[PDB]
Structure 1
Amino acid sequence: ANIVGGIEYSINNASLCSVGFSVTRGATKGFVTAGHCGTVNATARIGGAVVGTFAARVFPGNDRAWVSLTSAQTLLPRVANGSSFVTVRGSTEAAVGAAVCRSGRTTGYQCGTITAKNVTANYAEGAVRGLTQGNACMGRGDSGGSWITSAGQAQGVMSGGNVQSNGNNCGIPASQRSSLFERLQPILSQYGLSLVTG
Structure 2
Amino acid sequence: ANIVGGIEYSINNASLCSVGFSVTRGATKGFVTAGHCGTVNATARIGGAVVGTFAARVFPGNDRAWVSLTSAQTLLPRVANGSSFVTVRGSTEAAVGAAVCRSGRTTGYQCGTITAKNVTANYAEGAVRGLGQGNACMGRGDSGGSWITSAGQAQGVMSGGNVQSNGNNCGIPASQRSSLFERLQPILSQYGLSLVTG
Please indicate the TM-score interval, normalised by the length of the shorter structure.
over 0.9
1:114 lines up with 2:144 in the alignment: no
Give per-residue Cα distances to partners, 1:161-188, cap 9 Å, x unaligned: 0000100000000000000000000000
Task: Report how many residues are paired.
Answer: 198
Give per-residue Cα distances to partners, 1:77-123, cap 9 Å, x unaligned: 00000001000000000000000000000000000000000000011
The structure 1 segments of at least 4 consecutive aligned residues displaced by more than 6 Å after TM superposition are none
Q: How far apart in 2 are the matches of 1:20 and 1:157? A: 6
Structure 1: runs of 5+ lacking an equivalent: none
Q: How far apart in 1 are the matches of 2:139 and 2:172? A: 12
SS at match of 1:136: coil
Give per-residue Cα distances to partners, 1:49-84, cap 9 Å, x unaligned: 000000000000000000000000000000000001
TM norm structure 1:
1.00
Q: How far apart in 2 are the matches of 1:124 and 1:38? A: 15
1:186 lines up with 2:178 in the alignment: no
Q: How far apart in 1 are the matches of 2:11 and 2:124? A: 21
What displacement does 1:124 show? 1.1
Q: How far apart in 2 are the matches of 1:184 and 1:132? A: 10
SS at match of 2:190: helix
Structure 2: runs of 5+ lacking an equivalent: none
Q: How far apart in 2 are the matches of 1:174 and 1:56? A: 34
SS at match of 1:187: helix
Q: Which residue of 2 aligns with 1:63?
A: 63
SS at match of 1:181: strand
What displacement does 1:143 show? 0.2
Q: How far apart in 1 are the matches of 2:26 and 2:43? A: 21
What displacement does 1:195 show? 0.2
TM norm structure 2:
1.00
What displacement does 1:152 show? 0.3
